[PDB]
Design a binder for this molecule. Sequence first.
Ligand SMILES: Nc1nc2c(ncn2[C@@H]2O[C@@H]3COP(=O)(O)O[C@H]3[C@H]2O)c(=O)[nH]1
Ligand SMILES: Nc1nc2c(ncn2[C@@H]2O[C@@H]3COP(=O)(O)O[C@H]3[C@H]2O)c(=O)[nH]1
Ligand SMILES: [Cl-]
Ligand SMILES: [Cl-]
Ligand SMILES: [K+]
Ligand SMILES: [K+]
Ligand SMILES: [K+]
Lengths: 131, 130
Amino acid sequence: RRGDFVRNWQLVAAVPLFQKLGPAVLVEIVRALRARTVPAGAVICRIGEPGDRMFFVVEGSVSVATPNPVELGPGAFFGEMALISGEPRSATVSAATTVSLLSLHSADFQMLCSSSPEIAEIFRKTALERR
Amino acid sequence: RGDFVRNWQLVAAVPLFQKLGPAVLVEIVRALRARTVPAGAVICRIGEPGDRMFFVVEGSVSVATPNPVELGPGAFFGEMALISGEPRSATVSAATTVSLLSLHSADFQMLCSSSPEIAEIFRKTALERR
Ligand SMILES: Nc1nc2c(ncn2[C@@H]2O[C@@H]3COP(=O)(O)O[C@H]3[C@H]2O)c(=O)[nH]1
Ligand SMILES: Nc1nc2c(ncn2[C@@H]2O[C@@H]3COP(=O)(O)O[C@H]3[C@H]2O)c(=O)[nH]1
Ligand SMILES: [Cl-]
Ligand SMILES: [Cl-]
Ligand SMILES: [K+]
Ligand SMILES: [K+]
Ligand SMILES: [K+]
């Protein structure tokens, strides 16, 4: 899908994390990432459910329903904890505003992790801080 | 007192209210009604009159639009009837057991004129939804 591919470049530009990727790995993730828009209030992922993908916020913000809610703005990522640990979602995440998201399925996530050990590390430490 | 102190811990779960200073926060904590709705139960029904709006504290709701919309903690719904004066545009049910906070019409009017920022969020989310 070509339309999806060329649109992904401007969306990927919104996520500073990918500034750490060379051209080849950028193409891989720009191929792998799916763009979606989530209306305000809508559940993106639900506590206790299985997680097969992780998300990057392009525009808007999400709300992690931890006892003290966590707002995540553009460039932020979530959903990595279930991918790393294999456990169900630890928290519900909803669109706080209408949200533009990029999602990464599990296989592509592991491919990004081997393709970039620096980014693997960031997901790793971030998931540790969050749990 | 019991309902009042319970609302403080429930209001924490709705980030929208972080836009509110202490004096308006208080009026709203005074005004909000807490309910737990069992899974599957109708919270509001399409075509019926709406005199209140809702904030999701815990659990999620399902908006019976042609393609259903699930709203999670922190989300709000029912504002469209309060703004437009029209009947509920959709049925909303508890998707799971749901902890809600509700606001009657008058206290919604109060929240809106007391927080123009929040009135605007309600306004432009309602237009998005419509
Ligand atoms: N449990 C938890 N999750 C958080 C926090 N901040 C952000 N999140 C994200 O919310 C996500 C919910 O689903 P996951 O368990 O996949 O991964 C979680 C994290 O990526 C936090 O403080 N605690
Ligand atoms: N009509 C409509 N209502 C929605 C949508 N998403 C959430 N809702 C909520 O569902 C509610 C049903 O009652 P209201 O019409 O009072 O207000 C509505 C909104 O707050 C949507 O996409 N369309
Ligand atoms: Cl919405
Ligand atoms: Cl909302
Ligand atoms: K950005
Ligand atoms: K949660
Ligand atoms: K009220």
